[PDB]
């Protein structure tokens, strides 16, 4: 019963909460080290990446925009779906070997923990 959010106002980077974070949960802060379960599929449903324990510093400047701009909007414990044009993913570059140039992606993200950086 949750709505899509159009993050950038152009239809090309959209997020929906699939499983809300529970009462009292909050958003991660940039500079925290987050751990996510990330599933990536081509807009057609082909699964191209799965990482159950992906650790990264939220806000690192080279994280694809589709994640940098969506993960801060999640609560810890939330699962979200992100639909993102290639413009906000790997663009004309693609991600070898399985993501071609210009691929729109569906990202399913579960934010597991968020911990202060060192």
Curated annotation (Swiss-Prot):
Binds the immunosuppressant FK506 only in its calmodulin/calcium activated form. Widely expressed. Highest levels seen in the brain. Highly abundant in the retina. It comes from the Eukaryota. Changing residue 60 to N: Abolishes calcium-binding and reduces affinity for BCL2. Ca(2+) binds at residues 60, 62. Homomultimers or heteromultimers (Potential). Forms heterodimer with calmodulin. When activated by calmodulin and calcium, interacts with the BH4 domain of BCL2 and weakly with BCL2L1/BCLX isoform Bcl-X(L). Does not bind and inhibit calcineurin. Interacts with ZFYVE27; may negatively regulate ZFYVE27 phosphorylation. (Microbial infection) Interacts with hepatitis C/HCV protein NS5A. Residues 31-115 form the PPIase FKBP-type domain. Constitutively inactive PPiase, which becomes active when bound to calmodulin and calcium. Seems to act as a chaperone for BCL2, targets it to the mitochondria and modulates its phosphorylation state. The BCL2/FKBP8/calmodulin/calcium complex probably interferes with the binding of BCL2 to its targets. The active form of FKBP8 may therefore play a role in the regulation of apoptosis. Involved in the inhibition of viral infection by influenza A viruses (IAV). The lineage of its organism: Eukaryota, Metazoa, Chordata, Craniata, Vertebrata. This is Peptidyl-prolyl cis-trans isomerase FKBP8. It is found in: Mitochondrion; Mitochondrion membrane. Ubiquitinated by PRKN during mitophagy, leading to its degradation and enhancement of mitophagy. Deubiquitinated by USP30.
């Amino acid at each position: 019963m949750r709505e899509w959010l159009d993050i950038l106002g152009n239809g090309l980077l959209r997020k929906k909460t699939l499983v809300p974070g529970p009462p009292g949960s909050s958003r991660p802060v940039k500079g925290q080290v987050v751990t996510v379960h990330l599933q990536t599929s081509l807009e057609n449903g082909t699964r191209v990446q799965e990482e159950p324990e992906l650790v990264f510093t939220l806000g690192d400047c080279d994280v694809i925009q589709a994640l940098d701009l969506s993960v801060p909007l999640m609560d810890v414990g939330e699962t979200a779906m992100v639909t993102a044009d290639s413009k906000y993913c790997y663009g004309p570059q693609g991600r070898s070997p399985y993501i071609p140039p210009h691929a729109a992606l569906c990202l399913e993200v579960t934010l597991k923990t968020a911990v202060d950086g060192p």
